[PDB]
Design a protein around this ligand. Structure first.
Ligand SMILES: CCCCCCCCCCCCCCCCCC(=O)OC[C@H](COP(=O)([O-])OCC(O)COP(=O)([O-])OC[C@@H](COC(=O)CCCCCCCCCCCCCCCCC)OC(=O)CCCCCCCCCCCCCCCCC)OC(=O)CCCCCCCCCCCCCCCCC
Ligand SMILES: CCCCCCCCCCCCCCCCCC(=O)OC[C@H](COP(=O)([O-])OCC[N+](C)(C)C)OC(=O)CCCCCCCCCCCCCCCCC
Ligand SMILES: CCCCCCCCCCCCCCCCCC(=O)OC[C@H](COP(=O)(O)OCCN)OC(=O)CCCCCCCCCCCCCCCCC
Ligand SMILES: CCCCCCCCCCCCCCCCCC(=O)OC[C@H](COP(=O)(O)OCCN)OC(=O)CCCCCCCCCCCCCCCCC
Ligand SMILES: CCCCCCCCCCCCCCCCCC(=O)OC[C@H](COP(=O)(O)OCCN)OC(=O)CCCCCCCCCCCCCCCCC
Ligand SMILES: CCCCCCCCCCCCCCCCCC(=O)OC[C@H](COP(=O)(O)OCCN)OC(=O)CCCCCCCCCCCCCCCCC
Ligand SMILES: CCCCCCCCCCCC(=O)OC[C@H](COP(=O)(O)OCC[N+](C)(C)C)OC(=O)CCCCCCCCCCC
Ligand SMILES: C[C@H](CCC(=O)O)[C@H]1CC[C@H]2[C@@H]3[C@H](O)C[C@@H]4C[C@H](O)CC[C@]4(C)[C@H]3C[C@H](O)[C@]12C
Ligand SMILES: *C(=O)CCCCCCCCCCCCC
Lengths: 122, 127, 171, 166, 88, 81, 71, 124, 128, 12, 220
């Protein structure tokens, strides 16, 4: 990636730390930030025997896809639309993570401005 | 360089013996002199029936041999294994542990008749 | 040992064989197989032994510097992928004396003719040993060369294990 | 399950039939390379049936059929793990061995010991499936070492060659 | 194996075939007894090349100790036949 | 079965890459005496072999011939289902 | 091995071929390219990409939640 | 040439050149082709260690020292670069993955009685 | 020009690069002929019984008997307990024994201390 | 042409 | 495991760039691919590594049969410098030897594409050692270089084998054996990939310069 050149060969204070982020509170900037939703209950994922890493916020689409495959057998070329939905949700889920990294970058780049403005005037 | 006259003479004398020895290693038409056998009647039938090599000839022969192989190497062994598993192994605790089948929303249990409640309506999306 | 001429020829063969490994393609090998030939023809008519030895001495070093690290080897030659492959099947002929008569009856002609070779070897041994004594110095044989048979009807001395040796490609 | 269990063990037992019938006298030679190649074909067919059941509903089971030895609080059984990895590698292994064995009927035709060559190829296949299906570490160790020995016997096939033994 | 066997005539027919493709040897003045360094006046370097072409021809190496003695096509034929156990 | 070796006079080094070897060997006072022994490699069925990019495309034109029909059968036949 | 066409060897000449092995060889080679072209037509997104990779430097400083620097 | 008389037990046994049997001439008509020995020839003290299935001393196209420098140099360089790549990893510019139900507290093992500290995730 | 070859214990000098194979006077020429005289005499003796058709045994080789004898039964009577052997015997005989004693003794003393203090994890250890 | 194969005694 | 595989895949692939024996180039190809699998185990992708075993079984076992067919035809000649001109002389071996190489190098939609490409993408978009990632990518380029070496020397150009050679690949056992493994090297990956249940969350969204790394490096 390109951000690596901005963290190892550049300023290490205005770059997110992948093992520590997010640093700022969830509400720092959002007045009425909403809470995330989970459509699938635990007992539904527990009964579907989803791998722990598959029990994310996209589980409901994965459950639908697996159910379709069991019923479309022996047609292994079916359920190509249910599978696509589960992949599109993961793309949406993955995008949110990208925003969090960018949100961390700008807040870190905005928290350094104070250290400039503060020490500058004072 | 080159063989000396004695070297050529020896190589030539040895060469004659070598060829004569190699020639004597050839089997005569009679050999090998196989002793009498106990030829079976089933073998007798297929030899004459397959001396012409017709396509419909070996097709029967191929089916005949594969049917025998299936009976003695698949059907008989599976009979023994099923008897072993069913009446000797599966009669002991925790001998064959099957991962319980996955229950998805909207299914019906064949053993109690319950219906799994469907999933909550998805909020919205496309693609 | 090896004389000066032999080293030059042995070096010449090695250089071409290693050169053929660097070239692969025949036309390229032929082009450089003739440039290398000139390097020997140029000094072919040398008369000074001391200078000739120096040229060979420096030629070997030039070869060792340019040798292919993985030179081509014929499959059956020492170091090849088929070297000594068929030694597993080379069985010595004396093993047949232990065959059971049941096994020996399956080849009546072979063992009736192998017996003739038995008699020929058996009746030719005394003359074999006798000839080697009379044609050997008092001190002892100073070389490994064996003389050929002199008279008629006498087989070459020490012939059995060269004549009856196992075939190159048995079963 | 009565079919998933039986057809998963029949594949393993089908591969031991040629070995048993050769170490005893119940067959005729000159067909052994073809006889062994035919067994792999059927084992491949029988192995695909449990695989399809797995693909259908993801069914799995563990077969601890024989209690071999108990060491105080350690119980060791001849256990087989017919799961994702075992149900998808056995069909693939038998398919490739099917082609290689048929290929070897032409590459080793002139070899005096072709019959022993196929027996050693089959013994390797048996021990690899023991390794793949092992449910406990001792049974996995049986196939772990078995493959090594068969490799040793097969690498040094031409034992008159010093470089082969090395 | 699955390869054609060698015959004394076949070996001879191939030894001469290679030499008759040697631009430094006159075809008509060539037989199965022409000494290379006494009839065709070849340098001993040529005999190294000739023997090399006889081992590339038959696919087996000839050791140098035995290679610098086959000074005639017949000796090449009698050496290849002996090595490969040809007798007819 | 005495194999009939073909005529040896047909092996010639003109029209083959061995020709270019003679030109650059004759320009420096040398000749390739074994040119004809290597001539069979550049003559007959062995002549005019394929190139690497040409080898990878073995069967492409026939494969393309079937592909256009397959998609052609796709553009058509799509209005019935 | 001992079985199949009895293709006699040839000396310094191109080996004999059977029309059977030249049609089977050409068929599977053409089968390979049909599969590659057919799969490309329907599944070009599995080699080129499926979803548009977002550009972080285009998201407005409000959706990400960055507040005005004065605050 | 006997071994030095340093009281190690060699005695009068010859000290033959420390050359493996691979270096011997393979085209010679040895009495023992596999061992490459002649009947009656003195045997090296370490003949069992110098058979063709064991230690080889044949000349190499490259010097012994130069091979050691390059092999060690390669291994040393690779290990050093694996340490640099471990302290400076490569990662995609994304935040941590998010899981529901207090980060799957019950699913991934946890006391069902003790209530975890809520780890609810938000939107963006 | 030509980097000189550096022989070693496990990489012998090539016979072509050896200076001893090019400066050969009559003294070495005679030596190379005396060795062949010994080699030919031994070869003749071996062949006169290898080819004998009345032999059905083993051609005993004194060279092999001397090799086996020199390696087993001739070592102690030709051994002297001097400085070299005494130190080599202790370094390779007692050295490894003492070293392994302190490796295991320290390891078990450390583990024994933890077990009595409860600092060692033996939750499921019921086989020993 | 069916050469004789020298083998050790397999009878025993 | 990630670093152990990375050193192995790059080292063994580098060795195959100069080996002349055909059975050793493929053997070093196998060692390079096993290191690729262990890299997959190192990036926490156990199921992708298993898939590469199933896919690698088909197109690798075929290559040895193809090389075995060439060696048998040239009288046990295993050195590629004594091969050549076999493109039109052994048409079915050439066809099989080309499908296997393309499957090995990662030609799109063959059996090898359905495992190697996912592995490479899963490696570029993972929190992984950087040097190991570079070695893996460099090894992928080396994979295509020695595949060209086998095809170029063993099939293309003019023949370099002895004069009397019985090039004959017309045995039903030989053709049928290669034929089945040629079908697997074309379709086996597709069938398995569309039948095995998903056990992880594949990474499908990434920069365009990480999705085509495997394909671009192979072409170079
Ligand atoms: C499978 C095991 C196969 C072992 C074997 O074949 O050895 C002989 C076999 C013979 O080798 P060969 O070179 O082909 O034989 C050629 C001879 O010239 C022989 O030439 P031949 O083919 O003409 O003759 C065939 C056979 C002919 O043999 C016979 O005719 C009679 C043999 C009868 C033996 C029966 C013994 C038991 C009888 C008493 C109990 C009966 C009570 C009844 C109530 O003769 C032999 O092979 C030698 C006899 C070996 C007997 C010992 C093996 C049995 C031990 C148990 O050995 C090997 O090939 C090497 C195999 C090495 C083993 C590697 C794998 C070991 C690890 C896996 C173990 C699996 C454990 C079980 C699974 C548990 C987890 C799932
Ligand atoms: C802590 C590890 C366990 C301790 C033991 C392992 C440490 C290394 C010691 C083992 C090697 C010595 C044991 C005797 C070796 C017997 C075989 C032999 O002589 O080697 C010949 C063979 C030679 O085979 P080759 O492949 O080099 O053949 C070269 C060409 N020809 C065939 C002509 C000889 O070498 C080995 O196989 C030994 C390699 C293992 C040693 C390296 C270990 C990795 C470091
Ligand atoms: C941990 C790793 C272990 C590694 C093992 C080491 C290798 C050993 C060699 C391989 C042996 C494989 C044997 C597989 C078959 C099992 C043998 C068997 O069935 O024995 C009878 C078995 C008794 O076992 P069990 O009931 O568990 O009681 C403990 C006794 N040890 O069960 C019974 O009680 C009887 C059941 C069979 C009776 C019906 C069979 C009918 C068949 C008729 C046709 C023949
Ligand atoms: C990354 C994970 C994988 C890790 C595995 C890979 C690690 C490889 C590391 C690189 C290894 C390179 C080899 C370095 C050791 C070299 C030792 C050596 O060369 O000594 C050999 C010694 C030579 O001595 P001699 O022949 O008498 O003359 C001097 C020649 N210069 O002759 C002798 O044998 C004498 C005894 C000395 C033994 C050497 C010392 C022990 C080491
Ligand atoms: C602890 C034991 C330490 C032994 C080493 C000390 C002995 C020593 O350094 O050598 C002294 C002496 C050498 O005498 P010096 O004048 O130097 O010249 C030789 C003339 N005899 O040596 C001698 O001359 C006589 C020999 C004295 C040493 C005898 C005891 C040595 C112990 C050898 C190791 C025993 C191995 C036991 C292994 C058992 C388990 C495997
Ligand atoms: C007995 C052989 C083993 C069983 C194989 C099972 C094959 C399932 C049926 C194959 C089939 O019908 O074709 C599926 C697929 C071609 O279908 P496709 O054209 O891609 O669909 C339209 C895409 N828009 O795929 C094909 O192109 C057909 C290829 C069929 C042969 C596949 C051979 C696989 C080898 C065994 C794999 C290992 C076993 C696990
Ligand atoms: C991605 C990076 C690619 C760069 C390496 C290309 C490469 O390794 O090229 C491929 C070639 C392999 O064939 P070769 O040795 O040239 O063949 C012989 C031709 N000679 C004689 C002209 C050299 O590599 C080599 O020279 C081998 C050593 C490679 C060490 C690394
Ligand atoms: C059916 C199978 C393949 C024949 C074919 O190519 O169609 C043939 C090949 C050799 C046969 C086997 C061998 O003849 C050895 C056994 C002899 C008896 O037929 C009993 C089963 C026995 C094990 C045979 C079963 C089957 O008939 C075989 C396996
Ligand atoms: C970054 O995510 C680590 C993986 C990068 C692999 C190398 C591909 C080249 C990318 C260069 C950096 C991007 C500059 C546009």
């Amino acid at each position: 990636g390109a951000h690596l050149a901005r963290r190892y060969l550049g300023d290490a204070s205005v770059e997110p730390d992948p093992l520590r982020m997010p640093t700022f509170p969830p509400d720092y900037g959002f007045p009425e930030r909403k809470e995330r939703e989970m459509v699938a209950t635990q007992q539904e994922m527990n009964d579907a025997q989803l791998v722990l890493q598959q029990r994310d916020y996209c589980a409901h689409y994965l459950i639908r896809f697996l159910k379709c495959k069991r019923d479309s057998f022996p047609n292994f070329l079916a359920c190509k639309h249910e599978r696509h939905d589960w992949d599109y949700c993961e793309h949406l889920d993955y995008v949110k993570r990208m925003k969090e990294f960018e949100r961390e970058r700008r807040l870190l780049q905005r928290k350094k401005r104070r250290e400039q403005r503060e020490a500058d005037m004072a | 360089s080159g063989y000396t006259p004695e070297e050529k003479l020896r190589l030539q004398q040895l060469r004659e013996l070598r060829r004569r020895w190699l020639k004597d290693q050839e089997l005569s038409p009679r050999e090998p002199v196989l002793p009498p056998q106990r030829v079976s009647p089933v073998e007798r039938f297929w030899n004459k029936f397959l001396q012409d090599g017709a396509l419909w000839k070996n097709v029967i022969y191929k089916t005949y041999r594969h049917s025998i192989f299936a009976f003695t190497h698949v059907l008989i062994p599976v009979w023994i294994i099923h008897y072993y598993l069913k009446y000797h192994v599966t009669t002991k605790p925790y001998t064959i542990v099957e991962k319980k089948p996955r229950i998805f929303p909207g299914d019906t249990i064949l053993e109690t008749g319950e219906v799994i409640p469907p999933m909550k309506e998805f909020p919205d999306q496309h693609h | 040992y090896l004389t000066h001429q032999q080293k030059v020829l042995r070096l010449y063969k090695r250089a071409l064989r290693h050169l053929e490994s660097w070239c692969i393609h025949r036309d390229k090998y032929r082009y450089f197989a003739c440039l290398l030939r000139a390097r020997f023809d140029e000094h072919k008519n040398e008369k000074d032994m001391v200078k000739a030895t120096q040229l060979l001495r420096e030629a070997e070093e030039e070869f060792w510097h340019g040798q292919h690290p993985q030179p081509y080897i014929f499959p059956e030659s020492p170091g090849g992928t088929s070297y000594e492959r068929y030694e597993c099947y080379k069985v010595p002929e004396w093993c047949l004396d232990d065959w059971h008569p049941s096994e020996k009856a399956m080849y009546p002609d072979y063992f009736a003719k192998r017996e003739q070779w038995k008699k020929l070897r058996r009746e030719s041994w005394e003359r074999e040993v006798k000839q080697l004594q009379e044609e050997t110095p008092v001190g002892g044989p100073r070389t490994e060369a064996l003389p050929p048979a002199r008279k008629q009807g006498d087989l070459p001395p020490l012939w059995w294990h060269i004549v009856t040796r196992p075939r190159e490609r048995p079963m | 399950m009565n079919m998933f269990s039986s057809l998963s063990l029949v594949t393993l037992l089908l591969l031991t039939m040629p070995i048993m019938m050769m170490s005893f006298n119940t067959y005729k030679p000159s067909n052994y390379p073809l006889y062994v190649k035919t067994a792999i074909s059927y084992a491949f067919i029988t192995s695909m049936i449990p695989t399809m059941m797995f693909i259908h509903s993801g069914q799995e089971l563990i077969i601890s059929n024989w209690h071999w030895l108990t060491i105080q609080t350690l119980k060791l059984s001849l256990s087989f793990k017919m799961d994702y990895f075992s149900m998808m590698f056995i069909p693939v292994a038998l398919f490739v061995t099917w082609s290689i064995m048929e290929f070897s009927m032409w590459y080793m035709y002139s070899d005096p010991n072709i019959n022993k060559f196929f027996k050693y190829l089959l013994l390797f296949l048996i021990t690899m499936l023991i390794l793949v299906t092992a449910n406990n570490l001792f049974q996995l160790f049986i196939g772990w070492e078995g493959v090594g020995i068969m490799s040793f016997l097969l690498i040094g096939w031409w034992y008159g060659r010093a470089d082969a033994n090395t | 194996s699955d390869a054609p066997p060698l015959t004394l005539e076949g070996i001879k027919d191939r030894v001469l075939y290679v030499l008759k493709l040697y631009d430094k040897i006159d075809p008509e003045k060539l037989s199965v007894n022409s000494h290379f360094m006494k009839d065709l006046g070849l340098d001993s370097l040529d005999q190294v090349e000739i023997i090399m072409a006889m081992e590339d021809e038959f696919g087996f190496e000839i050791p140098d100790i035995d290679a610098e003695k086959l000074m005639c096509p017949q000796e090449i034929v009698d050496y290849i036949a002996d090595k490969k156990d040809v007798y007819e | 079965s005495k194999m009939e070796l073909p005529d040896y006079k047909q092996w010639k080094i003109e029209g083959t890459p061995l020709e270019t070897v003679q030109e650059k060997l004759a320009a420096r006072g040398l000749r390739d005496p074994w040119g004809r022994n290597e001539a069979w490699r550049y003559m007959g069925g062995f002549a005019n072999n394929v190139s690497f990019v040409g080898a990878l495309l073995k069967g492409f034109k026939w494969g393309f011939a079937a592909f256009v029909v397959a998609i052609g059968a796709e553009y058509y036949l799509e209005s019935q289902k | 091995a001992g079985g199949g066409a009895h293709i006699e060897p040839r000396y310094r000449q191109f080996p004999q071929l059977t029309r059977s092995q030249v049609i089977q060889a050409e068929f599977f080679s053409a089968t390979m390219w049909f599969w590659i072209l057919w799969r490309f037509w329907h599944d070009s997104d599995a080699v080129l990409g499926h979803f548009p990779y977002p550009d972080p430097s285009q998201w407005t400083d409000e959706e990400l939640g960055i507040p005005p620097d004065d605050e | 040439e006997p071994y030095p008389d340093d009281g190690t037990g060699y005695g009068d046994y010859p000290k033959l050149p420390d050359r493996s049997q691979q270096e011997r001439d393979p085209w010679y008509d040895w009495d023992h082709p596999d061992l490459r020995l002649n009947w009656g020839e003195p045997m090296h003290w370490d003949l069992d260690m110098y058979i063709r299935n064991r230690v080889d001393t044949s000349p190499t196209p490259v010097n012994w020292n130069l091979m050691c420098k390059h092999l060690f140099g390669f291994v040393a360089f690779m290990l050093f670069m694996f340490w640099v790549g471990e302290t400076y990893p490569a990662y995609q510019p994304v935040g941590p993955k998010q899981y529901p139900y207090n980060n799957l507290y019950l699913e991934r093992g946890g006391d069902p009685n003790k209530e975890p500290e809520p780890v609810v995730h938000y939107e963006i | 020009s030509f980097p000189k070859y550096e022989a070693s214990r496990l990489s012998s000098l090539p016979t072509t690069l050896d200076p001893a194979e090019y400066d050969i006077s009559s003294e070495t020429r005679k030596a190379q002929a005396e060795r062949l005289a010994i080699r030919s005499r031994l070869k003749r003796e071996y062949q006169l019984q290898y080819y004998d058709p009345s032999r059905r045994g083993v051609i005993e080789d004194p060279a092999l008997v001397r090799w086996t004898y020199a390696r087993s039964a001739n070592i102690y009577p030709n051994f002297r307990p001097n400085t070299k052997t005494s130190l080599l015997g202790a370094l390779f005989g007692i050295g490894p024994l003492v070293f392994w004693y302190y490796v295991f003794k320290t390891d078990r003393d450390r583990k024994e201390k933890l077990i009595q203090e409860g600092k060692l994890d033996r939750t499921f250890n019921i086989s020993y | 042409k069916r050469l004789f194969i020298i083998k050790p005694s397999g009878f025993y | 495991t990630l670093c152990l595989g990375a050193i192995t895949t790059l080292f063994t692939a580098m060795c195959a760039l100069t080996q002349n024996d055909i059975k050793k180039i493929i053997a070093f190809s196998t060692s390079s691919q096993l290191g690729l699998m262990m890299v997959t185990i190192g990036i926490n992708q156990p199921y992708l590594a298993f898939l590469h075993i199933c896919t690698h079984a088909f197109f690798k076992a075929m290559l040895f049969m193809c090389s075995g067919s060439i060696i048998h035809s040239l009288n046990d000649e295993q050195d590629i410098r004594k091969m050549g001109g076999l493109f039109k002389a052994m048409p079915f071996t050439t066809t099989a030897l080309i499908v296997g190489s393309l499957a090995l190098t990662g030609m799109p939609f063959l059996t090898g594409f359905y495992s190697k490409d996912l592995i490479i993408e899963a490696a570029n978009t993972s929190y992984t050692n950087a040097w190991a990632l570079l070695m893996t990518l460099i090894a992928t380029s080396f994979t295509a270089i020695y595949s060209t070496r086998i095809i170029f020397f063993a099939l293309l150009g003019q023949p370099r084998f002895p004069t009397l050679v019985n090039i004959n690949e017309n045995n039903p056992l030989l053709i049928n054996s290669i034929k089945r493994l040629l079908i697997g090297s074309l379709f086996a990956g597709y069938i398995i990939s569309n039948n095995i249940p998903p056990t992880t969350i594949p990474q499908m969204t990434m920069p365009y310069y990480l999705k085509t790394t495997a394909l671009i490096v192979t072409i170079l």
